[PDB]
Amino acid sequence: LVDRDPIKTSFEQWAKPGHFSRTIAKGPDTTTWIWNLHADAHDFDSHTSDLEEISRKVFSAHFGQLSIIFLWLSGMYFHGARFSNYEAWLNDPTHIGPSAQVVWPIVGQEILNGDVGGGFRGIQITSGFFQIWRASGITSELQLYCTAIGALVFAGLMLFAGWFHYHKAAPKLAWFQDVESMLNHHLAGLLGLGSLSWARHQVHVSLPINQFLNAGVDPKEIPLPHEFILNRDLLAQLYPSFAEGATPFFTLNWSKYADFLTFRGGLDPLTGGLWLTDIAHHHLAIAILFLIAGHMYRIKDILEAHKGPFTGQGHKGLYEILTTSWHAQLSINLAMLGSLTIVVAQHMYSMPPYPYLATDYATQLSLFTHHMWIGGFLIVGAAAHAAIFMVRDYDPTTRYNDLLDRVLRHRDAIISHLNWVCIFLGFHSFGLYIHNDTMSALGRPQDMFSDTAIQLQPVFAQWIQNTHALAPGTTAPGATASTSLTWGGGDLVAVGNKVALLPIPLGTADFLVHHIHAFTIHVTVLILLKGVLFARSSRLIPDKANLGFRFPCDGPGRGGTCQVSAWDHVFLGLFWMYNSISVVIFHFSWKMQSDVWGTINDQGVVTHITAGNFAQSSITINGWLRDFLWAQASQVIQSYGSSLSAYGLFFLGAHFVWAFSLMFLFSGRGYWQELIESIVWAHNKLKVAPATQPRALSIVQGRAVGVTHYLLGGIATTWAFFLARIIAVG
Amino acid sequence: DYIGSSTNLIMVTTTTLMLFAGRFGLAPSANRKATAGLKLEARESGLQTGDPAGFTLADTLACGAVGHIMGVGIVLGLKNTGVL
Amino acid sequence: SDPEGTGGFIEPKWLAYGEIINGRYAMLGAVGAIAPEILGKAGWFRTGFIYNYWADSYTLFVFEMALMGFAEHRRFQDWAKPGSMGKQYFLGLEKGLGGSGEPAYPGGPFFNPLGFGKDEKKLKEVKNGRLAMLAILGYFVQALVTGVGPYQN
Ligand code: CLA
Ligand code: CLA
Ligand code: CLA
Ligand code: CLA
Ligand SMILES: CC(=CC=C/C(C)=C/C=C/C=C(C)\C=C\C=C(C)\C=C\C1=C(C)CCCC1(C)C)/C=C/C1=C(C)CCCC1(C)C
Numbered sequence: 001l002v003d004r005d006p007i008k009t010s011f012e013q014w015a016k017p018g019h020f021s022r023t024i025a026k027g028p029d030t031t032t033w034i035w036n037l038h039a040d041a042h043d044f045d046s047h048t049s050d051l052e053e054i055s056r057k058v059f060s061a062h063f064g065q066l067s068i069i070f071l072w073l074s075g076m077y078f079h080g081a082r083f084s085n086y087e088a089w090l091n092d093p094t095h096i097g098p099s100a101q102v103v104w105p106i107v108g109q110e111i112l113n114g115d116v117g118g119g120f121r122g123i124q125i126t127s128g129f130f131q132i133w134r135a136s137g138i139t140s141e142l143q144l145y146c147t148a149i150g151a152l153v154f155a156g157l158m159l160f161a162g163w164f165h166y167h168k169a170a171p172k173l174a175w176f177q178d179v180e181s182m183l184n185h186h187l188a189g190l191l192g193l194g195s196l197s198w199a200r201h202q203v204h205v206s207l208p209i210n211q212f213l214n215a216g217v218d219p220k221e222i223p224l225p226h227e228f229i230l231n232r233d234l235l236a237q238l239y240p241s242f243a244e245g246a247t248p249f250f251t252l253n254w255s256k257y258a259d260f261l262t263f264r265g266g267l268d269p270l271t272g273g274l275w276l277t278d279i280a281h282h283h284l285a286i287a288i289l290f291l292i293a294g295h296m297y298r299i300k301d302i303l304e305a306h307k308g309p310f311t312g313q314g315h316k317g318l319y320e321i322l323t324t325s326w327h328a329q330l331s332i333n334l335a336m337l338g339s340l341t342i343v344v345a346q347h348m349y350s351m352p353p354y355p356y357l358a359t360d361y362a363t364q365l366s367l368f369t370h371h372m373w374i375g376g377f378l379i380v381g382a383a384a385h386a387a388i389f390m391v392r393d394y395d396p397t398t399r400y401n402d403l404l405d406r407v408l409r410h411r412d413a414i415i416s417h418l419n420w421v422c423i424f425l426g427f428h429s430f431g432l433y434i435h436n437d438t439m440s441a442l443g444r445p446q447d448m449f450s451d452t453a454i455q456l457q458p459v460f461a462q463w464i465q466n467t468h469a470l471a472p473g474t475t476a477p478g479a480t481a482s483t484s485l486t487w488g489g490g491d492l493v494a495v496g497n498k499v500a501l502l503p504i505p506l507g508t509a510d511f512l513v514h515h516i517h518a519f520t521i522h523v524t525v526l527i528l529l530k531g532v533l534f535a536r537s538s539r540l541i542p543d544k545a546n547l548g549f550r551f552p553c554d555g556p557g558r559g560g561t562c563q564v565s566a567w568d569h570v571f572l573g574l575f576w577m578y579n580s581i582s583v584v585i586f587h588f589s590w591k592m593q594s595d596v597w598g599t600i601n602d603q604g605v606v607t608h609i610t611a612g613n614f615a616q617s618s619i620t621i622n623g624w625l626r627d628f629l630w631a632q633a634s635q636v637i638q639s640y641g642s643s644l645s646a647y648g649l650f651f652l653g654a655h656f657v658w659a660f661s662l663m664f665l666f667s668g669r670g671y672w673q674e675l676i677e678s679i680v681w682a683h684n685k686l687k688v689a690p691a692t693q694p695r696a697l698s699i700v701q702g703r704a705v706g707v708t709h710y711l712l713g714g715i716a717t718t719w720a721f722f723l724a725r726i727i728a729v730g
Numbered sequence: 731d732y733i734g735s736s737t738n739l740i741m742v743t744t745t746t747l748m749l750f751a752g753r754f755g756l757a758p759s760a761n762r763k764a765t766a767g768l769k770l771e772a773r774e775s776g777l778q779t780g781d782p783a784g785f786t787l788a789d790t791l792a793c794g795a796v797g798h799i800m801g802v803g804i805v806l807g808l809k810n811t812g813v814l
Numbered sequence: 815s816d817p818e819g820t821g822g823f824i825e826p827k828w829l830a831y832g833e834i835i836n837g838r839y840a841m842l843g844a845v846g847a848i849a850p851e852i853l854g855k856a857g858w859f860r861t862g863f864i865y866n867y868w869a870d871s872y873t874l875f876v877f878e879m880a881l882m883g884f885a886e887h888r889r890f891q892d893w894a895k896p897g898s899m900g901k902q903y904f905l906g907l908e909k910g911l912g913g914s915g916e917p918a919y920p921g922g923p924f925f926n927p928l929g930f931g932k933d934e935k936k937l938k939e940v941k942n943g944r945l946a947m948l949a950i951l952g953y954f955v956q957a958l959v960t961g962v963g964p965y966q967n
């Protein structure tokens with residue numbers, strides 16, 4: 001390509017058919033290249049055979065995410081502001097049931113807008129702003145309206161840094177191809193200087209402006225816009241102005257104190273969102289580390305070190321090419337970023353970190369399943385992109401004889417095991433349930449697997465739960481309750497509208513879901529593991545790195561020779577994970593409502609959204625639609641003519657879109673060709689078709705329009721199924 | 731000032747405790763593991779004299795030497811030494 | 815053509831050398847000490863107060879810093895050069911009268927040659943020391959320990 005250059009046009013390329021592999025989009029017309037162009041639009045086997053740029057693009061086309069997450073948030077802060085309900089909800093929590101969005105009464109619309117709290121028509125929320133927002137050491141609607149434009153500021157600017165890259169004549173190699181410092185910085189002072197900084201604006205301002213909110217008032221009968229400077233006088237109620245101490249150290253006297261923190265654990269009676277008196281200390285006690293920690297270092301050295309006998313000789317030298325990969329140092333990350341998201345999903349529901357959550361049921365489970373699909377949707381990826389490594393990234397083979405060349409050495413092996421693992425599971429991990437049916441429908445309970453028939457006896461208790469809620473008696477200092485109230489030992493009194501967390505008991509019907517997870521988590525990974533491992537060569541095809549990591553299927557021979565590849569192992573690996581997460585969700589809420597969520601009154605006689613129906617009745621896998629799907633969902637199929645209605649009214653579409661995927665999943669290809677011409681014929685008679693040769697779907701595009709649909713179908717189905725059984729009773 | 735002035739000098743009791751016990755512990759480095767109580771390099775009693783740890787970790791007690799009694803159960807007896 | 819803006823190791827430093835030079839006499843408070851008897855404070859807490867102040871008020875504050883910023887970028891264009899600035903007046907041969915030239919310092923030239931007896935007995939130092947005058951009032955705005963005060967003393 002010209003047009004023409006090198007050097008010697010500014011005149012930009014708008015006009016002249018094509019670009020992207022060289023007997024390119026050819027003069028001669030076609031359609032396939034219009035899904036080409038969008039797909040693989042980002043890729044790197046083309047653009048140039050030379051690293052250089054690519055990192056100079058990804059550090060820019062990156063940017064436009066932050067900026068975006070930044071245009072987003074703004075319409076959420078704005079939204080969570082003038083489309084109010086926040087002002088109204090906060091003087092009045094336990095009571096309200098929040099909104100931010102509202103229609104405009106065009107056509108049918110309005111049904112969707114149904115009285116939500118501080119006196120107005122709207123559609124609800126299961127996205128816990130209104131609750132980060134508890135923070136506001138200040139309060140005010142127009143104020144969020146500054147935090148809002150403060151958002152659009154970071155954006156335009158944190159979006160003109162993206163002009164101020166690639167398009168501007170760019171940095172180069174050394175800049176990233178000296179890695180030497182990167183984490184040094186990152187973790188030290190941002191990971192640090194945020195958490196740190198967050199400390200300073202987490203007791204300064206917030207703690208006090210909810211220390212005396214957890215009582216009454218109406219805001220501006222509290223927390224001015226400046227009030228919190230030098231005036232270290234209201235900081236007087238929430239500890240000393242250090243009195244006689246000077247910059248910690250010890251020649252200090254406490255005859256009666258010990259700074260803010262004074263460590264909690266449990267839950268505010270009046271706002272059980274976990275205590276804040278702590279929340280500063282923990283973030284402070286973070287940062288320090290990061291503050292000390294981001295001070296390594298300059299790199300091989302540490303990895304060029306510990307080897308052994310069978311261990312990893314190539315451990316030593318574990319990648320020069322880890323300054324020369326991406327597709328590698330992205331895949332690693334996704335496993336972590338991803339696997340480090342759904343660890344949120346627990347510490348959240350068994351330890352709320354915001355005021356008013358749990359009581360708020362629906363506004364932190366939405367969460368625990370949204371955060372849950374990322375700690376999964378980012379993991380199969382975290383494999384895909386390793387397959388993208390394993391196939392291609394490096395120039396030649398300069399990488400040699402090491403940890404990997406090792407793992408591969410065995411490979412019909414690491415995956416030889418893992419397999420049997422799964423059929424051991426599955427048999428012990430699902431037909432287990434099927435016993436029950438076949439023998440409870442035969443009907444002889446003597447011999448089921450009930451929490452009571454097969455020998456276990458009115459106790460689960462003695463394991464580690466019961467040595468967690470009881471541990472404030474070790475090296476442990478203490479502080480009433482535990483760490484997470486859901487643990488075996490002691491305490492009850494949690495909240496005065498509805499409930500929050502309490503013990504959460506186990507045994508079987510907790511024993512075996514917990515095991516289906518195993519088998520589910522395991523056969524997921526089998527297919528990804530073997531998939532990324534056998535990326536490039538095999539004894540079904542060895543001539544098998546020769547195009548890319550996709551390729552439809554090699555060809556009718558060898559018997560099958562179809563699925564193979566690794567786009568496709570990252571195609572049938574999604575297919576499982578949709579279950580992996582989709583059944584983990586199914587788990588939590590049936591627990592968390594069967595027990596936990598429920599409610600106090602006199603003598604606090606607890607009354608769960610369901611008197612533990614779980615008991616003897618999830619163990620039957622029909623009980624999973626006797627007690628679940630057919631029981632709850634009665635709220636989705638009753639939901640017409642209401643306010644939420646948009647869920648029942650989705651629940652048919654998307655419970656349709658899924659049942660459209662199979663068409664894309666289950667079908668041939670020269671088929672819709674053979675068909676597309678009958679069409680093309682009738683077209684030509686009137687004189688109406690040929691130009692831009694209309695073509696069927698690109699074997700693997702077809703699979704691309706399976707899967708993606710099967711998910712946005714099979715998923716939102718419950719996104720509806722859910723929001724419709726926590727809004728309204730529960 | 732205040733007692734925090736006798737504590738202004740106590741910046742020394744940590745920072746000089748730290749940094750004066752600094753250089754030696756990183757000085758003949760490029761070393762990693764190892765010392766005398768292991769693999770070949772050799773002589774005993776065990777001993778005796780080799781710094782940072784010994785002297786300054788003893789100085790935290792030392793800061794409580796002369797300010798002792800004066801801060802404690804305030805003043806007693808008729809000159810504990812007997813001399814004028 | 816399109817306007818220019820050359821970055822190169824260290825423009826950011828020539829104009830960053832300059833920014834502080836202007837701020838070194840926009841230091842103001844102790845450079846011209848008669849400036850504030852109490853004017854450093856824009857307008858205590860107690861503070862001082864035994865507003866902030868009487869005042870010289872007002873509005874027409876943006877229009878200034880904008881409109882005379884609509885000059886900063888003119889002694890930055892005009893004297894790109896091709897000179898004709900002295901448009902003089904169409905007629906009249908009587909306009910020898912000059913004024914200076916291009917000025918930096920005691921003016922047209924230096925001038926009145928003839929000098930030294932008594933006054934008696936580069937130039938980043940004429941910079942360096944006045945951030946050591948700038949950043950100094952910087953903390954002196956918040957220059958307090960308040961609950962306590964000078965430990966020193
Ligand atoms: C006003 C400016 C402007 C102009 C005229 C250009 C022009 C160009 N850029 Mg570019 N760029 C810009 C701003 C601009 N850029 C900014 C602000 C960034 C960083 C944010 C970049 C980052 C960038 C990179 C990495 C690259 C270019 C490249 C190019 C060249 C190819 C452009 C193209 O066809 O992409 C078409 C794409 C668009 C017009 C849209 C850009 C996508 C982002 C910024 C916004 C869209 C996201 C949006 C939310 C859509 C998703 C939601 C959807 C449902 C609506 C071309 C000369 C490429 C090059 O050098 O040749 C190989 C190179 O790849 N640019
Ligand atoms: C940190 C990571 C992130 C980044 C930066 C990338 C980057 C990349 N990936 Mg990737 N990937 C990721 C996470 C990431 N991935 C994860 C988590 C997975 C697992 C699902 C994958 C699975 C994956 C595959 C299989 C492939 C890539 C490929 C690529 C490359 C092609 C990108 C492209 O052209 O856009 C592609 C995006 C589109 C064409 C847009 C279509 C999006 C559709 C499906 C919409 C999604 C549904 C949504 C609900 C619809 C919107 C709403 C609607 C109803 C209105 C690029 C380098 C491709 C490659 O060939 O490598 C060179 C290869 O195809 N990725
Ligand atoms: C995951 C599931 C699984 C398991 C573990 C069981 C287990 C059981 N079923 Mg059962 N069942 C299942 C799926 C399963 N079922 C399914 C899917 C169905 C429908 C297809 C049924 C339909 C069914 C019926 C109708 C009945 C049972 C019954 C039983 C019980 C009698 C078993 C027996 O006598 O075998 C004999 C046992 C052996 C020969 C033991 C040896 C096998 C073990 C030891 C293999 C271990 C490997 C070894 C330890 C590895 C170590 C290596 C070594 C070197 C150390 C037993 C509890 C019966 C019952 O009444 O239960 C109450 C009843 O007959 N099942
Ligand atoms: C084209 C075909 C024909 C038709 C009309 C259907 C229709 C349906 N099938 Mg189906 N099916 C077919 C052939 C067909 N099938 C074949 C050949 C098979 C294989 C044998 C199947 C196998 C199958 C299965 C397994 C299932 C279905 C199901 C369904 C139903 C989903 C419920 C629903 O849509 O409520 C109708 C109400 C609406 C669609 C309201 C829509 C309002 C919303 C979406 C907003 C308005 C639209 C707007 C554009 C969307 C927003 C998008 C925006 C971003 C642009 C639907 C009635 C599913 C079911 O529900 O029970 C069986 C089930 O999953 N089918
Ligand atoms: C018939 C129709 C439609 C349907 C539809 C259906 C029947 C369905 C659909 C669906 C869709 C969807 C569904 C989309 C979407 C979405 C979304 C937005 C999602 C989201 C989410 C997330 C966030 C993730 C996951 C979950 C969820 C899903 C929730 C229409 C038709 C027509 C006609 C007549 C002609 C003309 C055109 C029209 C007018 C158009």
Ligand SMILES: CCCCCCCCCCCCO[C@H]1O[C@H](CO)[C@@H](O[C@H]2O[C@H](CO)[C@@H](O)[C@H](O)[C@H]2O)[C@H](O)[C@H]1O
Pocket residue numbers: 492493603604605606
């Ligand atoms: C749900 C199945 C039962 C199996 C577990 C039962 C074992 C423990 C007994 C009940 C557990 C619930 O704990 C609950 O006890 C009492 C209910 O009578 C309530 O008792 C509460 O009400 C009264 C008001 O002053 C007083 O008697 C108590 O001081 C107070 O704690 C509490 O709200 C709660 O602590």
Ligand SMILES: CC1=C(C/C=C(\C)CCC[C@H](C)CCC[C@@H](C)CCCC(C)C)C(=O)c2ccccc2C1=O
Pocket residue numbers: 663664665666667668669672695696697698699701702703
């Ligand atoms: C149904 C099906 C098809 C047929 C599907 C097709 C042809 C979908 C493509 C239809 C396009 C998206 C219609 C585009 C036309 C409009 C975009 C043009 C008008 C513009 C708008 C204004 C309407 C395949 O090609 C296929 C291939 C491989 C495996 C399975 C399948 C499969 O299951």
